[PDB]
Write a protein that binds this ligand. Structure first.
Ligand SMILES: *Cc1c(COP(=O)(O)O)cnc(C)c1O
Length: 352
């Protein structure tokens, strides 16, 4: 096939916001929330992309989970002085792209693996993303003014970066809606709180989002097209058609009807749980004394090395483990995650 390597990630103005009190200040989430990881920043400076694959040995995360579960208590936003200069503005926009550094490392690994020539730096990619958002090229007389205008806007986008076999980059920005209450009241809480409610919702005690999950009877073959993210997705598309059948059976609607707020989980040929069609997964386990642990499949299963998965691992919020697909039963709680919507709850509702 003539596939493209694919990266999709949130652009969210609420992640780097002009201070309401002082106009020279932009506010970003508390450093504990790990959006600006120094190690990863240095890895990129050093052209070290393969470190993205390395398992960060152990974590003193836990306690972070307790704190996240009190999302309104976060008052310590990071504050940065931002002038009306292009560099400062590009940096604000960069900080609104969710896990762009991690997306960058993964795309470089995939491109190297598929032997696709590539020489676009992270800073050059950022400029391309900006040109897409403002519909204007660097060097145009209106570039500066259009950057200022776009920055003031509050529209979220799902960004899609596609790299062809010849290394050509195409970018799309797909507008995405916000939950109405968050949209109305975003200005009243910290950026940290906004971030937690938007992207770590799955961890919250009183979350309302809860996708219905199908456990598939059909294994997938692990391949380069599962371990990496690309447009060659016939295997996931088949799973999603089967998800549709199962969810419609469950909900009592015609098998051909559209379905939403649902996901399908599948195993590899050895029967180990891999991932969902559009998310990585963590299953909820317990140990005495009944404390929850969130356990996510290892990359050895063939699942995608998701950026949201990587983020949650380095924060210590999930941990790797081996889960037999046969262990999931109706009623089981899971977490589902990707770099667009972050982490949400799901519940196993049917098997098919
Ligand atoms: C997008 C996707 C994920 C999640 O990857 P992120 O980098 O977190 O967005 C997981 N599995 C599959 C099959 C996907 O397409």
């Amino acid at each position: 096939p003539n596939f493209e390597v694919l990266a999709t990630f949130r652009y969210d103005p609420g992640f780097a916001r002009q201070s309401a009190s002082k106009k020279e200040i932009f506010e970003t989430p508390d450093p504990r929330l790990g959006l600006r990881d120094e190690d990863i920043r240095q890895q990129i400076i050093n052209e070290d992309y393969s470190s993205y694959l390395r398992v960060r040995e152990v974590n003193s995360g836990g306690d972070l989970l307790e704190n996240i579960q009190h999302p309104d208590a976060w008052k310590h936003d990071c504050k940065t002085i931002v002038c009306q200069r292009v560099e400062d503005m590009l940096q604000v926009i960069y900080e609104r792209f969710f896990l762009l550094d991690e997306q960058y490392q993964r795309i470089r690994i995939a491109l190297s693996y598929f032997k696709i020539d590539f020489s676009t730096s992270l800073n050059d990619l950022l400029k391309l993303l900006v040109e897409n958002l403002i519909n204007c090229k660097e060097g145009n007389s209106e570039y500066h003014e259009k950057i200022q205008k776009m920055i003031n806007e509050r529209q979220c986008y799902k960004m899609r970066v596609l790299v062809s076999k010849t290394g050509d980059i195409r970018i799309e920005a797909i507008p995405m809606p916000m939950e109405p209450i968050l949209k109305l009241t975003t200005d009243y809480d910290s950026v940290s709180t906004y971030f937690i409610k938007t992207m770590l919702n799955g961890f919250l005690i009183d979350s309302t989002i809860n996708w219905d999950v199908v456990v598939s009877s059909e294994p997938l073959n692990a391949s380069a097209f599962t371990s990496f993210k690309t447009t060659s997705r016939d295997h996931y598309a088949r799973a999603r058609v089967r998800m549709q059948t199962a969810i419609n059976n469950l909900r009592g609607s015609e098998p051909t009807s559209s379905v939403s707020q649902c996901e399908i989980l599948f195993s590899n040929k050895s029967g180990l749980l891999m991932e969902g069609s559009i998310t990585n997964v963590a299953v909820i386990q317990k140990d005495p004394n009944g404390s929850k642990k969130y356990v996510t499949p290892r990359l050895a299963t063939g699942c995608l090395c998701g950026t949201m998965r990587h983020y949650l691992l380095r924060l210590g919020l999930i941990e790797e483990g081996d889960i037999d697909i046969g262990s999931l039963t109706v009623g089981n709680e899971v977490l589902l995650f990707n770099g667009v919507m972050g982490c949400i709850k799901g519940t196993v509702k049917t098997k098919y």
